Protein backbone atom coordinates (compact mmCIF):
# COMPACT_ATOMS: atom_id res chain seq x y z
CA UNK A 1 0.00 0.00 0.00
CA UNK A 2 2.96 2.46 1.00
CA UNK A 3 3.01 5.01 4.33
CA UNK A 4 6.48 4.73 5.31
CA UNK A 5 6.75 8.74 5.95
CA UNK A 6 4.07 8.76 7.44
CA UNK A 7 5.15 5.66 9.89
CA UNK A 8 8.75 7.77 9.75
CA UNK A 9 6.38 11.31 11.25
CA UNK A 10 5.29 8.77 14.19
CA UNK A 11 8.61 7.61 15.47
CA UNK A 12 9.42 11.05 15.02
CA UNK A 13 6.99 12.31 17.39
CA UNK A 14 7.82 9.62 20.12
CA UNK A 15 11.52 10.98 19.84
CA UNK A 16 10.20 13.83 20.71
CA UNK A 17 8.93 12.93 23.63
CA UNK A 18 5.30 11.05 22.97
CA UNK A 19 4.74 7.99 24.93
CA UNK A 20 2.86 6.20 22.07
CA UNK A 21 1.73 7.61 18.83
CA UNK A 22 -1.12 6.05 16.32
CA UNK A 23 -2.57 6.85 12.79
CA UNK A 24 -4.17 5.52 10.10
CA UNK A 25 -4.80 6.47 6.38
CA UNK A 26 -6.41 5.47 3.43
CA UNK A 27 -5.11 6.83 -0.10
CA UNK A 28 -7.85 6.54 -2.18
CA UNK A 29 -8.49 2.60 -0.93
CA UNK A 30 -6.47 0.34 1.38
CA UNK A 31 -6.85 1.55 4.95
CA UNK A 32 -3.15 1.76 6.55
CA UNK A 33 -2.76 1.85 10.34
CA UNK A 34 0.35 2.90 11.93
CA UNK A 35 1.82 2.92 15.65
CA UNK A 36 5.04 4.49 17.04
CA UNK A 37 6.41 4.21 21.10
CA UNK A 38 3.88 2.61 23.36
CA UNK A 39 0.40 2.29 21.07
CA UNK A 40 -2.17 0.31 20.02
CA UNK A 41 -3.49 0.90 16.16
CA UNK A 42 -7.17 0.59 16.94
CA UNK A 43 -6.92 2.82 20.25
CA UNK A 44 -9.51 5.18 21.02
CA UNK A 45 -8.77 8.73 22.24
CA UNK A 46 -10.21 11.90 23.17
CA UNK A 47 -11.08 13.61 20.18
CA UNK A 48 -10.77 17.29 21.58
CA UNK A 49 -12.15 20.34 19.32
CA UNK A 50 -12.59 17.71 16.67
CA UNK A 51 -15.85 17.49 18.35
CA UNK A 52 -17.06 20.93 16.68
CA UNK A 53 -17.27 19.52 13.09
CA UNK A 54 -19.90 16.99 14.56
CA UNK A 55 -21.52 19.95 16.16
CA UNK A 56 -21.52 22.55 12.94
CA UNK A 57 -22.51 19.28 11.30
CA UNK A 58 -25.81 18.91 13.03
CA UNK A 59 -26.52 22.51 12.88
CA UNK A 60 -25.83 22.92 9.17
CA UNK A 61 -28.28 19.88 9.13
CA UNK A 62 -30.88 21.37 11.22
CA UNK A 63 -30.58 24.24 8.40
CA UNK A 64 -31.25 22.10 5.27
CA UNK A 65 -34.78 21.14 7.31
CA UNK A 66 -35.54 24.40 7.33
CA UNK A 67 -35.42 24.62 11.21
CA UNK A 68 -33.35 27.24 11.91
CA UNK A 69 -31.04 30.35 9.57
CA UNK A 70 -27.85 29.92 10.74
CA UNK A 71 -27.45 34.16 10.08
CA UNK A 72 -29.95 34.52 13.26
CA UNK A 73 -28.98 36.54 15.45
CA UNK A 74 -27.85 33.99 18.80
CA UNK A 75 -30.36 35.80 21.12
CA UNK A 76 -33.43 34.16 19.14
CA UNK A 77 -32.21 30.98 20.15
CA UNK A 78 -30.95 31.90 23.59
CA UNK A 79 -32.59 34.90 24.57
CA UNK A 80 -30.98 37.10 27.62
CA UNK A 81 -27.25 34.55 27.54
CA UNK A 82 -25.10 36.62 25.99
CA UNK A 83 -25.13 40.12 27.55
CA UNK A 84 -22.36 40.20 29.61
CA UNK A 85 -19.98 42.87 29.92
CA UNK A 86 -20.32 43.63 26.08
CA UNK A 87 -21.35 40.65 25.13
CA UNK A 88 -24.37 41.15 23.06
CA UNK A 89 -26.10 38.36 20.90
CA UNK A 90 -28.71 40.81 19.43
CA UNK A 91 -25.59 41.17 17.16
CA UNK A 92 -24.08 37.74 16.77
CA UNK A 93 -24.76 35.47 14.74
CA UNK A 94 -25.09 31.34 14.77
CA UNK A 95 -22.81 31.42 11.80
CA UNK A 96 -19.95 33.37 13.69
CA UNK A 97 -20.33 31.05 16.88
CA UNK A 98 -18.97 28.34 14.19
CA UNK A 99 -16.28 30.22 12.19
CA UNK A 100 -15.00 32.11 15.66
CA UNK A 101 -16.36 35.73 14.54
CA UNK A 102 -18.32 36.09 17.26
CA UNK A 103 -15.47 37.86 19.37
CA UNK A 104 -17.08 36.06 22.13
CA UNK A 105 -14.22 35.62 25.00
CA UNK A 106 -13.34 32.02 25.31
CA UNK A 107 -13.98 30.56 28.74
CA UNK A 108 -11.06 28.32 28.91
CA UNK A 109 -8.58 31.42 29.07
CA UNK A 110 -10.63 32.56 32.18
CA UNK A 111 -7.98 32.62 35.02
CA UNK A 112 -9.75 30.47 37.68
CA UNK A 113 -11.08 28.10 34.97
CA UNK A 114 -7.22 27.74 33.99
CA UNK A 115 -6.41 27.45 37.63
CA UNK A 116 -9.09 24.54 37.99
CA UNK A 117 -8.84 22.72 34.75
CA UNK A 118 -5.41 23.55 33.37
CA UNK A 119 -2.95 23.59 35.84
CA UNK A 120 -1.98 21.68 38.88
CA UNK A 121 -5.49 22.24 40.18
CA UNK A 122 -6.77 19.41 37.63
CA UNK A 123 -5.72 16.80 40.34
CA UNK A 124 -8.70 18.24 42.39
CA UNK A 125 -11.13 19.22 39.79
CA UNK A 126 -11.43 16.81 37.39
CA UNK A 127 -14.29 14.82 37.69
CA UNK A 128 -16.46 18.22 38.17
CA UNK A 129 -19.43 18.93 36.30
CA UNK A 130 -19.57 21.63 34.50
CA UNK A 131 -22.95 22.71 33.00
CA UNK A 132 -22.94 24.77 29.53
CA UNK A 133 -24.37 27.59 30.86
CA UNK A 134 -21.89 27.52 33.86
CA UNK A 135 -19.01 27.63 30.91
CA UNK A 136 -21.10 30.72 29.14
CA UNK A 137 -21.19 32.38 33.03
CA UNK A 138 -17.43 31.81 32.84
CA UNK A 139 -17.24 33.76 29.58
CA UNK A 140 -19.69 36.58 30.36
CA UNK A 141 -18.05 37.58 32.97
CA UNK A 142 -15.22 39.69 30.51
CA UNK A 143 -15.70 41.70 27.77
CA UNK A 144 -15.62 40.04 23.90
CA UNK A 145 -12.41 40.05 22.34
CA UNK A 146 -13.59 41.97 19.20
CA UNK A 147 -17.13 43.34 17.78
CA UNK A 148 -19.12 40.09 15.95
CA UNK A 149 -16.84 40.05 12.31
CA UNK A 150 -14.40 42.01 12.92
CA UNK A 151 -11.70 39.67 13.41
CA UNK A 152 -10.98 35.89 13.61
CA UNK A 153 -10.36 34.14 17.21
CA UNK A 154 -10.71 31.00 18.42
CA UNK A 155 -12.98 30.06 21.19
CA UNK A 156 -14.39 27.19 22.92
CA UNK A 157 -17.68 29.10 24.09
CA UNK A 158 -18.73 29.55 20.38
CA UNK A 159 -19.15 25.97 20.40
CA UNK A 160 -20.77 25.74 23.77
CA UNK A 161 -23.45 28.54 22.93
CA UNK A 162 -23.36 26.21 19.45
CA UNK A 163 -24.82 23.04 21.72
CA UNK A 164 -27.25 25.45 23.42
CA UNK A 165 -28.59 26.45 20.22
CA UNK A 166 -28.77 22.15 19.23
CA UNK A 167 -30.61 21.50 21.97
CA UNK A 168 -33.14 24.50 21.55
CA UNK A 169 -33.86 23.75 18.07
CA UNK A 170 -34.46 19.46 19.00
CA UNK A 171 -35.61 19.84 22.09
CA UNK A 172 -33.03 17.16 23.15
CA UNK A 173 -29.30 17.39 24.44
CA UNK A 174 -27.15 18.06 21.40
CA UNK A 175 -25.53 14.41 21.82
CA UNK A 176 -28.34 12.60 21.28
CA UNK A 177 -28.21 14.64 17.68
CA UNK A 178 -24.70 13.72 17.09
CA UNK A 179 -25.51 10.03 17.40
CA UNK A 180 -28.46 9.90 15.78
CA UNK A 181 -27.21 11.77 13.24
CA UNK A 182 -24.35 10.90 12.51
CA UNK A 183 -22.40 8.07 14.72
CA UNK A 184 -25.52 5.76 14.00
CA UNK A 185 -25.86 6.41 10.50
CA UNK A 186 -22.12 5.97 9.47
CA UNK A 187 -21.92 3.55 11.86
CA UNK A 188 -19.15 4.62 13.84
CA UNK A 189 -18.61 1.67 16.65
CA UNK A 190 -16.05 3.66 18.40
CA UNK A 191 -17.69 7.14 18.67
CA UNK A 192 -18.96 8.36 22.10
CA UNK A 193 -20.28 11.35 23.77
CA UNK A 194 -19.35 10.88 27.33
CA UNK A 195 -20.99 13.71 28.71
CA UNK A 196 -20.01 13.60 32.09
CA UNK A 197 -18.25 9.70 32.19
CA UNK A 198 -15.28 9.92 32.77
CA UNK A 199 -13.76 6.53 32.03
CA UNK A 200 -11.94 5.54 28.54
CA UNK A 201 -13.11 2.87 26.76
CA UNK A 202 -10.84 -0.50 25.20
CA UNK A 203 -8.14 -0.82 23.22
CA UNK A 204 -6.45 2.58 24.74
CA UNK A 205 -3.50 3.64 25.67
CA UNK A 206 -3.02 5.82 28.93
CA UNK A 207 -2.69 9.72 28.19
CA UNK A 208 -0.27 12.07 29.76
CA UNK A 209 0.18 15.79 30.54
CA UNK A 210 2.46 18.39 32.27
CA UNK A 211 -0.67 20.81 33.51
CA UNK A 212 2.05 23.25 32.60
CA UNK A 213 4.54 24.75 31.03
CA UNK A 214 11.04 20.21 34.65
CA UNK A 215 7.46 19.51 35.58
CA UNK A 216 6.21 16.07 36.57
CA UNK A 217 4.18 14.15 34.25
CA UNK A 218 0.51 13.14 35.27
CA UNK A 219 -1.94 10.49 34.19
CA UNK A 220 -4.72 12.28 33.33
CA UNK A 221 -6.68 9.72 31.17
CA UNK A 222 -9.80 9.72 33.49
CA UNK A 223 -11.59 13.35 33.52
CA UNK A 224 -15.35 14.35 33.14
CA UNK A 225 -15.70 15.49 29.67
CA UNK A 226 -17.75 18.36 30.33
CA UNK A 227 -14.88 20.79 30.37
CA UNK A 228 -15.23 20.49 26.63
CA UNK A 229 -18.72 19.44 25.69
CA UNK A 230 -19.96 20.30 22.64
CA UNK A 231 -16.43 22.33 21.65
CA UNK A 232 -14.55 19.12 22.22
CA UNK A 233 -15.50 16.04 24.71
CA UNK A 234 -16.19 13.53 22.39
CA UNK A 235 -13.89 9.74 22.04
CA UNK A 236 -13.25 8.06 18.85
CA UNK A 237 -10.57 5.70 17.46
CA UNK A 238 -8.69 6.92 14.19
CA UNK A 239 -10.69 4.75 11.91
CA UNK A 240 -14.40 6.05 12.42
CA UNK A 241 -12.89 10.28 12.58
CA UNK A 242 -11.95 8.99 8.42
CA UNK A 243 -15.11 7.62 7.97
CA UNK A 244 -16.64 10.78 9.09
CA UNK A 245 -15.10 13.13 7.37
CA UNK A 246 -14.57 11.64 4.26
CA UNK A 247 -18.15 11.21 4.11
CA UNK A 248 -18.22 14.73 5.50
CA UNK A 249 -16.24 16.16 2.76
CA UNK A 250 -18.32 13.53 0.00
CA UNK A 251 -21.54 15.24 1.17
CA UNK A 252 -23.05 12.16 2.77
CA UNK A 253 -24.31 14.36 6.00
CA UNK A 254 -25.28 17.50 3.86
CA UNK A 255 -26.59 18.75 0.77
CA UNK A 256 -24.28 21.11 -1.50
CA UNK A 257 -25.75 24.08 0.29
CA UNK A 258 -24.95 23.01 3.18
CA UNK A 259 -21.35 21.64 2.43
CA UNK A 260 -20.60 25.21 0.45
CA UNK A 261 -21.40 27.09 3.13
CA UNK A 262 -19.37 24.77 5.69
CA UNK A 263 -16.58 25.04 3.33
CA UNK A 264 -16.83 29.02 2.72
CA UNK A 265 -13.64 30.30 5.08
CA UNK A 266 -12.14 32.89 7.08
CA UNK A 267 -8.53 33.68 6.87
CA UNK A 268 -7.42 33.31 10.32
CA UNK A 269 -3.84 34.37 9.63
CA UNK A 270 -1.98 36.99 7.67
CA UNK A 271 0.88 35.25 7.65
CA UNK A 272 -0.50 31.70 6.43
CA UNK A 273 -2.55 32.99 3.55
CA UNK A 274 -3.88 29.34 2.43
CA UNK A 275 -5.15 28.51 6.34
CA UNK A 276 -8.51 29.13 6.52
CA UNK A 277 -11.67 28.31 9.06
CA UNK A 278 -15.06 27.31 8.35
CA UNK A 279 -17.66 26.04 9.95
CA UNK A 280 -16.19 23.96 12.16
CA UNK A 281 -13.93 22.92 10.00
CA UNK A 282 -10.64 23.90 8.57
CA UNK A 283 -8.69 24.12 5.33
CA UNK A 284 -4.74 24.25 4.72
CA UNK A 285 -2.87 23.82 1.30
CA UNK A 286 0.27 21.83 2.42
CA UNK A 287 3.89 22.06 0.96
CA UNK A 288 3.49 19.97 -2.22
CA UNK A 289 0.02 21.86 -2.78
CA UNK A 290 -2.52 19.36 -2.03
CA UNK A 291 -5.53 21.28 0.38
CA UNK A 292 -6.97 19.21 3.07
CA UNK A 293 -10.05 19.55 5.17
CA UNK A 294 -10.01 18.58 8.55
CA UNK A 295 -9.57 20.00 12.19
CA UNK A 296 -6.91 19.57 14.71
CA UNK A 297 -7.76 18.08 18.44
CA UNK A 298 -6.22 19.23 21.86
CA UNK A 299 -7.67 18.11 25.53
CA UNK A 300 -5.55 16.89 28.20
CA UNK A 301 -2.86 14.19 27.23
CA UNK A 302 -4.64 13.81 23.88
CA UNK A 303 -3.56 15.68 20.56
CA UNK A 304 -5.38 14.77 17.65
CA UNK A 305 -5.31 15.27 13.78
CA UNK A 306 -8.17 14.59 11.38
CA UNK A 307 -7.72 15.62 7.69
CA UNK A 308 -9.34 14.25 4.22
CA UNK A 309 -8.88 15.90 0.53
CA UNK A 310 -11.57 18.28 -0.73
CA UNK A 311 -13.15 14.96 -2.54
CA UNK A 312 -12.62 12.79 0.64
CA UNK A 313 -10.95 10.26 -1.23
CA UNK A 314 -7.29 10.36 0.86
CA UNK A 315 -8.06 10.92 4.75
CA UNK A 316 -5.79 10.59 8.00
CA UNK A 317 -6.40 10.43 11.52
CA UNK A 318 -4.14 10.25 14.75
CA UNK A 319 -3.20 10.81 18.41
CA UNK A 320 -0.65 11.53 20.18
CA UNK A 321 -1.15 10.73 24.02
CA UNK A 322 1.36 13.88 25.57
CA UNK A 323 -0.10 17.45 25.11
CA UNK A 324 3.69 18.87 25.16
CA UNK A 325 5.16 17.11 22.24
CA UNK A 326 4.57 16.27 19.08
CA UNK A 327 4.77 17.72 15.70
CA UNK A 328 1.27 16.62 14.19
CA UNK A 329 1.80 18.92 11.33
CA UNK A 330 4.99 16.47 9.90
CA UNK A 331 2.54 13.81 10.43
CA UNK A 332 -0.32 15.24 7.74
CA UNK A 333 2.70 16.99 5.80
CA UNK A 334 4.51 13.02 5.61
CA UNK A 335 0.93 11.38 4.57
CA UNK A 336 -0.30 13.73 1.98
CA UNK A 337 3.41 15.24 0.54
CA UNK A 338 5.34 12.16 1.40
CA UNK A 339 7.99 14.93 3.38
CA UNK A 340 10.05 13.09 5.59
N1 LIG B 1 -2.43 21.76 30.71
C1 LIG B 1 -3.54 20.87 30.87
C2 LIG B 1 -3.98 20.08 29.66
C3 LIG B 1 -3.81 20.78 28.35
C4 LIG B 1 -5.07 21.08 27.55
C5 LIG B 1 -5.04 20.46 26.18
C6 LIG B 1 -3.78 20.74 25.40
C7 LIG B 1 -3.75 19.96 24.12
C8 LIG B 1 -2.59 20.45 23.29
N2 LIG B 1 -2.25 19.44 22.36
Redesign the pocket.
Known sequence: PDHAATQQALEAAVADGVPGAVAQARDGRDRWTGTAGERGGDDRYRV?SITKTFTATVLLQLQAEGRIDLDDPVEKWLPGVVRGNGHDGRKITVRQLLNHTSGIYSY?EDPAFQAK???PG?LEHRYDTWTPKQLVAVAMAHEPDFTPGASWNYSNTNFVLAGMVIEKVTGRPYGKAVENRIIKPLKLRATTVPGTRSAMPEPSSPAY?????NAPVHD?STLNPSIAGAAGEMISDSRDLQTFYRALLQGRLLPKSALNEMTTTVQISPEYPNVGYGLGLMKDKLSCGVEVWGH?????????LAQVTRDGGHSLAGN?NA??AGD?QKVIEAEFCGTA
Open positions: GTVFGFSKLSRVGGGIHGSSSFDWS
